[PDB]
């Protein structure tokens, strides 16, 4: 269920029927790889297979060494995305701490370990290279006289070691911090059980499990420490604490007058475009809709990129002049033509001499737009053209509603219209219009009634009086 | 040692104690791979191992052909990041130029060659595929009758050839220019020796070597030429000509009045946020603090993303009204709530009906913010919440100082406060205030004089004079 409404009155459109998925928090798990501690490589044998093993063994040592050294967006606050992952990493550097983990994962690959004052983290040994090298390659390289291992062991070692090399590779060129978290960091099976073993509700687990690829894109892997043959990096996973609350997407486009004389036109655009989701009695607003990802009718966003607004913000849709919320807009005179592709259609801002059309696959052009802001649904329409720009429309199923209304740009007197307020709003524009309007309301009032007053009598040594509308010498009446 | 100061007066905070690392110049290095020239592959044998070699050789051949075809940020200037690297590559295309390098690296893998008018470049043969194929595989693929090579050579060729395939892979989807420079492009040992051999001071050599993972992210590898069986690409490395000068980070957040009527409030924000570093008697200001990466107390930046400012710019922190520098600010009436996470705490701009708190791990909410701008240190605080946005704070060690002062937004009379200056400043704000004041000083001045004037005396054949506020017949006084 997805529906859409276009407001002719404000050159904007609301898409509804969406379900929320808001990242509200972070969970940090600690992923570990158990390591082998191999200094020198003792062998004088020039056997090809053993020769390969030392080259493969060297890639392992080198990897270790590398790892050892290791619109309204401007209104948003500023977070520290990995502040949480880093704090856990800081805890990991204490001496007694690693021994706890190493001991915890002694007989299992999965374990909970409590850090400092109460944080419970899930821990995961995903690869035991210590066991593999110590039970496989130990007979062949702990002695001069070297046991020429079968060819299949070389391959297997390459296979097992390969995971370590890519992880090292990723960290080496990303200064220990990667995103999205790759399947080298965490396989599909590993991740799925991690989510399941996470301290979260059933609703979250179901949502996350069916959309792990999104979970990966919103996760961080943080290289933390290599010490006492244990390699550990912190994985910071998104927590979606708000799910299945209603969401809607607001699309906007410039609404301008269409007078004949060029440069004589004025424009206005709603600046409050973006994703909106009901949240805790308020409304979460994401102005940069590119920070949200949509999959069918589920929308994934991050609260770090949101504002929290009163629900009356919705009124801007029904009544952009409502007295309860100051809908935000910008003004200009740059009447260039464009289109905004919505969920279920297209808004077309067509001005001047620009050619604006819509076409069908087999039929060709089926609607030609006149100057102004208009809309067409995706039913029977496949493409839209504005100027030299071709737009493919979205073919998702859903009903559109065309909400008729006088374009609000018509309500302004162009002679006092502030066309260069960028960070403006309805109330703010009105205030400035009243001031430009006030000084003309009063100046004309003053230029009148100014002439009802008597001019100055000539300045000479003679005295004057008023009679019949003119000054008469006092000397006359003497 | 990291400390931080919050200025209550301007809803801003400075984190200091950082040490600089500014890229001031560029060094261009030349990286080479010696190639084999194998046109057709002559062998009719359907032996499994040789079948594999021609497929890999084709992979070898295929790679070559592909390579053969081959806030205040808006105020910054515009550079050409790889202008130096591209220029050097351009020189390499000149006739005879390639021949010089090949001769230089005849008996060593490392050599210096001076180009055109005086530039001395470092040259590096990092892989000799010419030698390997010509001494290993030539006996097996230079003849119909083919010498069925052992399986370890097959493995070995794949290992040696793989680097070439990956270098080629990177360049193909990057139009011959990659960043960060991967470990296929340049191994840890390779990079390190290049750094050691650079024409730079000892301070620079040390910095780059202890932070090689950062160096990769700030370098470019530029695919240049394949000619006369020599493949050469230029690697453009950052020169950090400024090290260990003081740096500080300026955080800012909106400052509004807290009057009950929400539409009655005014806001002001310092716009000069970003990174600041002492540099050569001036201060380098990086408005887009995201172009810099911080590791402990070292801050890595690029001067291309900087302004060069008088050192008096610092005065805006202690006295935003100082007469020596015009501190930059923006104005609005948009009192929306948010938080800025600082180095050692968090700034909270909390307005209207928004709920703002900070919590600890075990204790929960420990401070509830009142409307206004306030601050909390990261000591004993783990999270901050503003509206629906949860912020994790930085847990780095360091002392914070809360600097008390009257919020400067309180110093403006709201009736003449210019709430629509976006790219503004202190002096500029004063200027508009003077103008609103000029027009009130005079409009009252004029209205005071026009309200002082007398109406026209009655029109009859008699003369009049003024007395007790109305016109009286002259006939009366005679």
């Amino acid at each position, epitope marked *: 269920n997805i529906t859409e409404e276009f407001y002719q009155s404000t050159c904007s459109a609301v898409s509804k029927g969406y379900l929320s998925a808001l990242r509200t928090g972070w969970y940090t798990s600690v992923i570990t790889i158990e390591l082998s501690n191999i200094k020198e490589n003792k062998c004088n044998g020039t056997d090809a297979k053993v020769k390969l093993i030392k080259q493969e063994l060297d890639k392992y040592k080198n990897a270790v060494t590398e790892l050892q050294l290791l619109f309204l967006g401007f209104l948003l606050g500023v977070g520290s995305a990995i502040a949480s992952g880093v704090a856990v990493c800081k805890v990991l550097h204490l001496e007694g701490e690693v021994n706890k983990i190493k001991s915890a994962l002694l007989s299992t690959n999965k374990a909970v370990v409590s850090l400092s004052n109460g944080v419970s983290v899930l821990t995961f040994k995903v690869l035991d290279l210590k066991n593999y090298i110590d039970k496989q390659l130990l007979p062949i390289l702990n002695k001069q006289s070297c046991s020429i291992s079968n060819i299949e062991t070389v391959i297997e070692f390459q296979q097992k070691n390969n995971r370590l090399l890519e992880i090292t590779r990723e960290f080496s060129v990303n200064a220990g911090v990667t995103t999205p978290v790759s399947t080298y960091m965490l396989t599909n099976s590993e991740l799925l059980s991690l989510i399941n073993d996470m301290p979260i509700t059933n609703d979250q687990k179901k949502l996350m499990s069916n959309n792990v690829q999104i979970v990966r894109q919103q996760s961080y892997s943080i290289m933390c420490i290599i010490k006492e043959e244990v390699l550990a990096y912190v994985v910071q996973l998104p927590l979606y604490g708000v799910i299945d609350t209603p969401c809607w997407k607001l699309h906007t486009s410039p609404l301008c007058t269409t007078n004949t004389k060029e440069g004589s036109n004025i424009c206005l655009t709603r600046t409050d475009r973006g994703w909106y989701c009901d949240n*805790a009695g308020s409304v979460s607003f994401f102005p940069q809709a590119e920070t949200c990802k949509v999959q069918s009718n589920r929308v994934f966003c991050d609260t770090m990129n949101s504002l929290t607004l009163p629900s009356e913000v919705n009124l801007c849709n029904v009544d952009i002049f409502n007295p309860k919320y100051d809908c935000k807009i910008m003004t200009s005179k740059t009447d260039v033509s464009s289109s905004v592709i919505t969920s279920l259609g297209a808004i077309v801002s067509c001005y001047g001499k620009t050619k604006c059309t819509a076409s069908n696959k087999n039929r060709g052009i089926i609607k030609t737009f006149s100057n102004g802001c208009d809309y067409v649904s995706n039913k029977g329409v496949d493409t839209v053209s504005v100027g030299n720009t071709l737009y493919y429309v979205n073919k998702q199923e859903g009903k559109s509603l065309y909400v008729k209304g006088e374009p609000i740009i018509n309500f302004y007197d162009p002679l006092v219209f502030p066309s260069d307020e960028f960070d403006a709003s309805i109330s703010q524009v009105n205030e400035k219009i009243n001031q430009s309007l006030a000084f003309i309301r009063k100046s004309d009032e003053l230029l009148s009634a100014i002439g009802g007053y008597i001019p100055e009598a000539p300045r000479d040594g003679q005295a004057y009086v008023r009679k019949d509308g003119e000054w008469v010498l006092l000397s006359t009446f003497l | 040692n990291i400390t931080e100061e919050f200025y209550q007066s301007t809803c801003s905070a400075v984190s200091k104690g950082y040490l600089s690392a500014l890229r001031t110049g560029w060094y261009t290095s030349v990286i080479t791979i010696e190639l084999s020239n194998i046109k057709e592959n002559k062998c009719n044998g359907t032996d499994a191992k040789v079948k594999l070699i021609k497929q890999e050789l084709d992979k070898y051949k295929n790679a070559v052909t592909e390579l053969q075809l081959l806030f205040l940020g808006f105020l910054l200037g515009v550079g050409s990041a790889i202008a130096s690297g591209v220029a050097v590559c351009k020189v390499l295309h000149l006739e005879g130029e390639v021949n010089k390098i090949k001769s230089a690296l005849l008996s060593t893998n490392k050599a210096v060659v001076s180009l055109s008018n005086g530039v001395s470049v470092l040259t590096f043969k990092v892989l000799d595929l010419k030698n390997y194929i010509d001494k290993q595989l030539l006996p097996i693929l230079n003849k119909q009758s083919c010498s069925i090579s052992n399986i370890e050579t097959v493995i070995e060729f794949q290992q040696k050839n793989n680097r070439l395939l990956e270098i080629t892979r990177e360049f193909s989807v990057n139009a011959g220019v990659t960043t960060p420079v991967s470990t296929y492009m340049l191994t840890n040992s390779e990079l390190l020796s290049l750094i050691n051999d650079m024409p730079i001071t000892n301070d620079q050599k040390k910095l780059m070597s202890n932070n090689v993972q950062i160096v990769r992210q700030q370098s470019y590898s530029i695919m240049c030429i394949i000619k006369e069986e020599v493949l050469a690409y230029v690697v453009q490395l950052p020169l950090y000509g400024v090290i260990d000068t003081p740096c500080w980070k300026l955080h800012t957040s909106p400052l509004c009045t807290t009057n009950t009527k929400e539409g009655s409030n005014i806001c002001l924000t310092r716009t000069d946020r970003g990174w600041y570093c002492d540099n050569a008697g001036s201060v380098s200001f990086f408005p887009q603090a995201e172009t810099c990466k911080v590791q402990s107390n070292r801050v890595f930046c690029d001067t291309m993303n900087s302004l060069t400012l008088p050192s008096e710019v610092n005065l805006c922190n202690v006295d935003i009204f100082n007469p020596k520098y015009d501190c930059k600010i923006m104005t609005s009436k948009t009192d929306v709530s948010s938080s800025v996470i600082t180095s050692l705490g968090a700034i909270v701009s909390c307005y209207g009906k928004t709920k703002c*708190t900070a919590s600890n791990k075990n204790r*929960g909410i420990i401070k509830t913010f009142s409307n206004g701008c306030d601050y909390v240190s990261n000591k004993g605080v783990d999270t901050v919440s503003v509206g*629906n946005t949860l912020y994790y704070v930085n847990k780095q060690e360091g002392k914070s100082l809360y600097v008390k002062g009257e919020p400067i937004i309180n110093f403006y009379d709201p009736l003449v406060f210019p709430s629509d200056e976006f790219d503004a400043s202190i002096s500029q704000v004063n200027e508009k205030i003077n103008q609103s004041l000029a027009f009130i000083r005079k409009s009252d001045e004029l209205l005071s004089a026009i309200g002082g004037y007398i109406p026209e005396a009655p029109r009859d054949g008699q003369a009049y004079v003024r007395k007790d506020g109305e016109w009286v017949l002259l006939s009366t006084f005679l």
Partner: nanobody
Amino acid sequence: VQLQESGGGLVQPGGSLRLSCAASGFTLDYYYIGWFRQAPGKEREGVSCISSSHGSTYYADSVKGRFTISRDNAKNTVYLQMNSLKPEDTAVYYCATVAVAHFRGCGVDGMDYWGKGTQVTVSS
């Protein structure tokens, strides 16, 4: 704003016990409610969180099956039913909550408001 746990008392092993958590100062729809416990000598640990609107639930592994959590929007109260109590369940049980907007996982590092606790003892 207050939270009040109740229902603590002496239980014999194998016995059952119900705790109540009265919410004041907020409405349930917008929040997550969690139950926590701290056993003797032990660090305080999570046991169960629930969504107020939808009723979705979380049970730690240790009690999964034995413990059930429920909520009554009308009575503005949250209940933890405990069945088949074991002496190892002897602990002080705490009520906690968080704005769904601020949800950061169930767990003591994930709580914003805390009850004063109620003692449970499983013993003969």
